[PDB]
Amino acid sequence: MDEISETNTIFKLEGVSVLSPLRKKLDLVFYLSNVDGSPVITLLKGNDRELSIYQLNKNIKMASFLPVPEKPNLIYLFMTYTSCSEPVVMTLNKENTLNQFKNLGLLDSNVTDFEKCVEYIRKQAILTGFKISNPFVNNSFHLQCHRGTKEGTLYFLPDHIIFGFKKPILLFDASDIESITYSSITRLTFNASLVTKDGEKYEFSMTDQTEYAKIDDYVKRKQMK
C-alpha cells in the first residue's frame, strides 16, 4: 500500500531509542501517505514498519516532551494513540538530533539549543493536524517515587499525571482523579494514593517530603475546578 520516499517524507529522525510499546532502536518518520494523501507517523527498522499512526487529528490523543530525570543530554517524546496499543515512548538524544536536523538543512546551522529541534517537531505536529505539549521548559514538576517495590518517575503535567516508565506506564487525566490522600508519613518521606472516578486506586510511595508542597497545590488547583 504505502511507500515512503524522499518525495513524500515531511521529516525523518534516525535511530531513536524506543522504550514502549517495544524496546528497539528505530526511525521516526512523518510522511504524507500516497494512499490518501494524509499525514502518517511511523517507526521503522530498515524498511519494516514496526508501528504506524494515521488520522493524527483524530487518533493522537496526547503528545508531550518530558525530561529524562538525571540525564539532560536526552528527552522523551511520549504519545498516546489508538492506531489502526500501549503508549509510545521515545528517547531522543539531544545532540544527535541537533546534528541530524542540521544535515537535513532544517537548522542554520551552528545553532546549539536543542529547543529549536523541539519547536520544529511541534510545528510539524501542527501542520500534520495534532499538537505536542512541552510543559517542562527551563510550573509542572516531576519526582522519583516507588510503585510497590520498583522505582519510577511521576510526572505532573498540566492536565495529566504520567507514572513511568517500567510496565505498565500509567496515564491519568486530571479529570479522572477523584482524590489524592496521604499515608505512610515517615520522618523523611510520605505516600500518596490516587483514586480514579472509575473506582481504581494507585499508591506512590517514598515521595520525599520536600515534594508535598507542589503535589498539594496541583491537587488543590485541579479540584478547585
From Swiss-Prot:
Which segments constitute the PH domain? 5-132, 139-222
Deletion phenotype: Decreases nucleosomal density. Increases HTA1 RNA level; simultaneous disruption RTT109 alleviates the effect.
Q: Where in the cell is it found?
A: Nucleus; Chromosome
Q: Look up the coiled coil feature and give its residue ranges.
A: none
Q: What is the effect of changing Y212A?
A: Impairs histone-binding
Quick one: where's region Double PH domain? Answer: 5-222
Q: What the record says about its domains?
A: The N-ter domain (residues 1-67) homodimerizes and interacts with H3-H4 independently of acetylation while the double pleckstrin-homology (PH) domain (residues 68-301) binds the 'Lys-56'-containing region of H3.
Q: Which family does it belong to?
A: Belongs to the RTT106 family.
Instruction: Please tell me what else the database record remarks about this protein.
Output: Present with 11100 molecules/cell in log phase SD medium.
Assembly and partners are described as: Homodimers (via the N-terminal domain). Interacts with the SWI/SNF complex. Interacts with the RSC complex. Interacts with the HIR complex. Interacts with the CAF-1 complex. Interacts with RLF2. Interacts with SIR4. Interacts with YTA7. Interacts with CAC2. Interacts with HPC2. Interacts with HIR2. Interacts with MSI1. Interacts with HIR1. Interacts with histone H3. Interacts with histone H4.
Q: What does this protein do?
A: Histones H3 and H4 chaperone involved in the nucleosome formation and heterochromatin silencing. Required for the deposition of H3K56ac-carrying H3-H4 complex onto newly-replicated DNA. Plays a role in the transcriptional regulation of the cell-cycle dependent histone genes by directly recruiting the SWI/SNF and RSC chromatin remodeling complexes to the histone genes in a cell cycle dependent manner. In cooperation with HIR and ASF1, creates a repressive structure at the core histone gene promoter and contributes to their repression outside of S phase.
Q: What is this protein called?
A: Histone chaperone RTT106
Species annotation: Saccharomyces cerevisiae (strain ATCC 204508 / S288c)
Q: Which gene encodes it?
A: RTT106
What part of the entire protein does this chain span?
65 to 304 of 455
